Write a protein that binds this ligand. Structure first.
Ligand code: DGT
Ligand code: CA
Ligand code: CA
Ligand code: CA
Ligand code: CA
Ligand code: CA
Length: 901
DNA sequence: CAGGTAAGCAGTCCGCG
DNA sequence: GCGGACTGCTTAC
């Protein structure tokens, strides 16, 4: 097989590389890598190296990496550019793997671990590591085994061995319900004392050294705790055995308010699953406890136990250990679904970076572009200092707040990356500038043509047309990948709808799910067999289709995020290719494109309708338009349609056969106007929206910019079995909105859009009547809690104290003195409830850690003093009032003359 | 910690005769 | 109590 790296490090003048050799074996080597850097040289100097601008360079080969780094410093002292890849391990990887890396995941050791630490005096701080580690479960991907290290004797209690037999039993049998599919994969090791446990763990770690290391909060908790505990018991040299090169570094992670400590283990790639999830999931969660996320992702119930975790080991060691094992498995289950590790490996190897660098689009693109340029013997410029400067972004149209019955939307495929490719925007393709006219002059096509030679953006920039820039070239490659995976995602989605349809008429038989590839549209034969299947088989097929869709989603949306990150990186001062001229060329072209096409669509539709000056485009954001289709439907007449699907078909046909060709002609003219390199503005129909045929539903409404709701029947070619709400920006979409309130507001909107005013009034009246029975967690608001200290003045709110911080301070006084009570963690999320006047907490609200029950100490008092009236008005009535006034609708029945009978 | 700008709403402080 | 200046938080792109 072709070799591939696992990890790479620079340690002094050596590269330390772990890799898979040509036989599939893991190896480690130390290489005295001699780096090269570059300086500009005279035109007469014969060379094959040129900077990105075509200026000749001489290569300087250094005796060692320190020599190279010192040379960079001296070049700064002289005042001359030091060119080339200054991150020497990226240069090493580029030299050693001068080919597209094909990796074999089965050979990469992926470790998933979790530790338990009993502590009677509050949260066990990793930097202190003052309490024994009493459990470790460490899953190894190569062995496919859960290795369980269990401390039986501790200063906090001596316990009996964990029983695998009890662990397997149902909760109703007194067991722990450790999933049957992992029972045979557990390797259980009990220990008489902690020193022995840790020594054996380290020997095990040396035998089975993780390449990728993951788990839940491992970077912020498990890794520093294990490192510091071992350091405290045995000394530093022993703790450094966690690194295969015996090198570690305390790394300070700092933001705008305070800092924290993590341990860098050289020769290991740590991908904490919480961070993978936050980056790659495109969710924003009220809580990031593993319990909360597992419930959300997997629909598994929380692991229940009696009493605090600080007493769980002594009271019920059996469950304590079973829960440690299940916690490790839950991360594996989430990954089986989301495939973030696979994503990271894909992106890391593609870029030729340390895998953990996938968190940084700047580093990722720096490496992609360097490797691309190196292929041509071109030489990357030195990174420079730039002051942070604001720059303009997208255009967003101000909508007229209203109901909108029939709506068709369109938006550009990969807008910003497509603009980059179309205009040819790149550091080395800048050709000059032209004298700019006001933006509206380009939008209305009255401005002088910018250039008859170069490709232009209405910010004044001109670009070469003779050859593609490296940014367009490399962005196109990742775009093509994204497009492939999105194809699979949408096929899986359409396949899901077929199954949902079939589930209306399930067959009374015993059978199996069909063995099919859900990434491809079902054939006629498959469709026929599906129509003959049982509910059991259909539901299994739906589950599989939906898992396939999720896998496609992960692969596509994060490749989209990467390419969009390149457009953004051009406006990030830490990017090697930072240039506000290029960043603004993208954003300003986008503003033009949107407003240009708004004009063209209006002109086209006024033509086909025989009107003048009428606004068909009601809204737009960045690269999208929302077109009122009422007059189109009305031109045929509603009574001509057999059912909802009939007019959806008609609008779909109108969009594809009339709208899109007109849109395309408008954009081709714009491309010619700007003299662009290639027409790539592809604005395809997104949504077809409207009320169900014959209903009193309103179809959709807008309250303002970035705040709307649509009843969608077809989304990017997926024809839904049941209408789906596309809701953007409204409170139903915000993690800060109480769970039960999101649900109720969503139902109000569904009723507005699908059923009408009377239906809405019926639901509101019921909700208002019953909501006091809702569980306190379901009606609590959520907020991130930053700067708790700033606003804390002797335990009381300081000037300008935010509402949620006030709540936290109220909580702190209420639990004061308790070493055991859960503390609110700076920067994490809290639940927030308002409190009735004259409550014993002495303030108008209380807040506590999100994803948790409030401590039993005060729970009864919170429940008793909760202000339901305020809660209802702020989270429910006020947003609903916003929706209904916008839609010109009443959520309460107004008086009428009929009342007099 | 890690990636760009636009823009919405909650809430504080305080004016507004 | 609404509106502005401001902070804080959170979404749409
Ligand atoms: N830097 C950055 N830019 C974004 C992000 N989301 C959207 N944008 C910018 C770049 C996009 O091209 C543009 C339009 O947003 P869209 O959500 O419609 O994405 P895009 O057109 O790229 O892909 P699409 O084919 O519509 O799925 O807005 C983001 O998360 N980061
Ligand atoms: Ca635990
Ligand atoms: Ca788009
Ligand atoms: Ca599309
Ligand atoms: Ca059937
Ligand atoms: Ca869009």
């Amino acid at each position: 097989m072709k070799e591939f790296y696992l990890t790479v490090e620079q340690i002094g003048d050596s590269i330390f590389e772990r890799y898979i050799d040509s036989n599939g074996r893991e190896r480690t080597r130390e290489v005295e890598y001699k780096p090269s850097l570059f300086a500009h040289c005279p035109e007469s100097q014969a060379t094959k190296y040129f900077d990105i601008y075509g200026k000749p360079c001489t290569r300087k080969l250094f005796a060692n990496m320190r020599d190279a780094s010192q040379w960079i410093k001296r070049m700064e002292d002289i005042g001359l550019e030091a060119l080339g890849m200054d991150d020497f391990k990226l240069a090493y990887l580029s030299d050693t793997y001068n080919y597209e890396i094909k990796y074999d995941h089965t050979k990469i050791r992926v470790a998933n671990f979790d530790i338990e630490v009993t502590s009677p005096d509050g949260f066990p701080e990793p930097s202190q590591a003052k309490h024994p580690i009493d459990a470790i479960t460490h899953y190894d991907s190569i062995d496919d085994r859960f290795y369980v290290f269990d401390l039986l004797n501790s200063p906090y209690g001596n316990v009996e061995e964990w029983s695998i037999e009890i662990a397997a039993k149902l909760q109703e049998q007194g067991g722990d319900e450790v999933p049957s599919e992992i029972i045979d994969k557990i390797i259980y090791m009990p220990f008489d004392n902690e020193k022995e446990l840790l020594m054996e763990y380290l020997n095990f770690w040396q035998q089975k050294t993780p390449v990728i290391l993951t788990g839940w909060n491992v970077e912020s908790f498990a890794i520093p705790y294990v490192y510091n505990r071992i350091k405290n018991i045995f000394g530093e040299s022993t703790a450094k055995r966690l690194s295969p090169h015996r090198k570690t570094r305390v790394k300070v992670i700092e933001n705008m308010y305070g800092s924290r400590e993590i341990i860098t283990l050289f020769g290991i790639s740590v991908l904490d699953y919480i961070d993978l999830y936050k980056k790659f999931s495109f969710t924003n969660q009220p809580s990031y406890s593993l319990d909360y996320i597992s419930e959300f992702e997997l629909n598994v119930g929380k692991l229940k136990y009696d009493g605090p975790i600080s007493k769980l080991r002594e009271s019920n060691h059996q469950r304590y250990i079973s829960y440690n094992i299940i916690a490790v498995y839950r991360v594996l289950q989430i990954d089986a679904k989301r495939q973030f590790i696979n994503l990271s490996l894909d992106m890391g190897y593609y870029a030729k970076i340390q895998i953990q660098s996938v968190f940084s689009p700047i580093k990722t693109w720096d490496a992609i572009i360097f490797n691309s340029l190196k292929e041509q013997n071109k030489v990357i410029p030195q990174g420079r200092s730039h002051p942070v400067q604001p720059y303009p972004g997208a255009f967003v149209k101000e909508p007229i707040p209203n109901r909108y019955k029939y709506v068709m939307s369109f938006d550009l495929t990969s807008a910003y990356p497509s603009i980059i490719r179309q205009v040819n925007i790149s550091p080395e393709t800048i050709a000059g500038t032209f004298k700019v006219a006001p933006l509206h002059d380009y939008i209305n096509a009255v401005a002088e043509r910018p250039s008859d030679v170069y490709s232009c953006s209405p910010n004044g920039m001109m670009y070469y047309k003779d050859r593609d820039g490296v940014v367009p070239t490399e962005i196109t490659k990742v775009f093509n990948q994204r497009k492939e995976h999105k194809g699979y995602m949408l096929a899986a989605q359409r396949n899901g709808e077929i199954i949902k349809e079939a589930l209306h008429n399930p067959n009374l038989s015993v059978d199996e799910p069909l063995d099919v590839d859900y990434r491809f549209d079902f054939s006629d034969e498959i469709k026929e067999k599906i129509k003959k299947l049982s509910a059991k088989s259909l539901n299994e097929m739906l589950f599989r289709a939906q898992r396939t869709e999720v896998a496609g989603m992960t692969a596509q949306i994060n490749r989209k995020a990467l390419i969009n990150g390149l457009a953004g990186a051009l406006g990030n001062v830490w990017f090697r290719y930072y240039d506000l001229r290029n960043a603004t060329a993208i954003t300003t072209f986008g503003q033009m494109a949107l407003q240009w096409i708004e004009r063209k669509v209006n002109e086209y539709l006024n033509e086909v309708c025989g009107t003048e000056g009428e606004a068909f485009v009601l809204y737009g954001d960045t690269d999208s338009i929302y077109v009122s289709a009422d007059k189109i439907i009305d031109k045929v007449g509603e009574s001509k349609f057999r059912d909802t699907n009939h007019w959806v078909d008609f609008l779909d046909k109108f969009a594809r056969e009339r709208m899109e060709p007109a849109i395309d002609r408008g954009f081709r003219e714009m491309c010619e106007y700007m003299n662009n390199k290639q027409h790539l503005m592809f604005m395809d129909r997104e949504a077809i929206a409207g009320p169900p045929l014959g209903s009193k539903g309103i179809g959709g409404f807008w309250t303002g910019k970035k705040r709307y709701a649509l009843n969608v029947w077809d989304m990017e070619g997926t024809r839904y079995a049941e209408p789906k709400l596309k809701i953007m920006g409204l409170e139903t979409q915000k993690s800060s909105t109480p769970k039960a309130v999101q649900k109720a507001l969503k139902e109000c909107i569904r009723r507005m859009l699908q059923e009408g005013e009377e239906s809405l009034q019926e639901y509101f009246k019921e909700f208002e009547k019953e909501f006091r029975q809702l569980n306190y967690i379901s009606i609590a608001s959520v907020s991130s809690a930053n700067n708790i200290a700033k606003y804390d003045v002797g335990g009381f709110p300081g000037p300008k104290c935010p509402f949620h911080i006030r709540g936290i301070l109220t909580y702190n006084r209420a639990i004061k003195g308790n070493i055991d009570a859960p503390q609110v963690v700076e920067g994490e999320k809290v639940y927030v409830l308002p409190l009735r006047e004259g409550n014993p907490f002495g303030d108008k609200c209380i807040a506590w850690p999100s994803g948790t029950e409030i401590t039993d100490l005060i729970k009864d008092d919170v429940l008793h003093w909760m202000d339901y009236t305020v809660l209802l008005e702020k989270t429910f009535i006020k947003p609903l009032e916003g929706f209904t006034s916008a839609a010109k609708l009443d959520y309460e029945k107004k008086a009428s003359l009929f009342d007099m009978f």
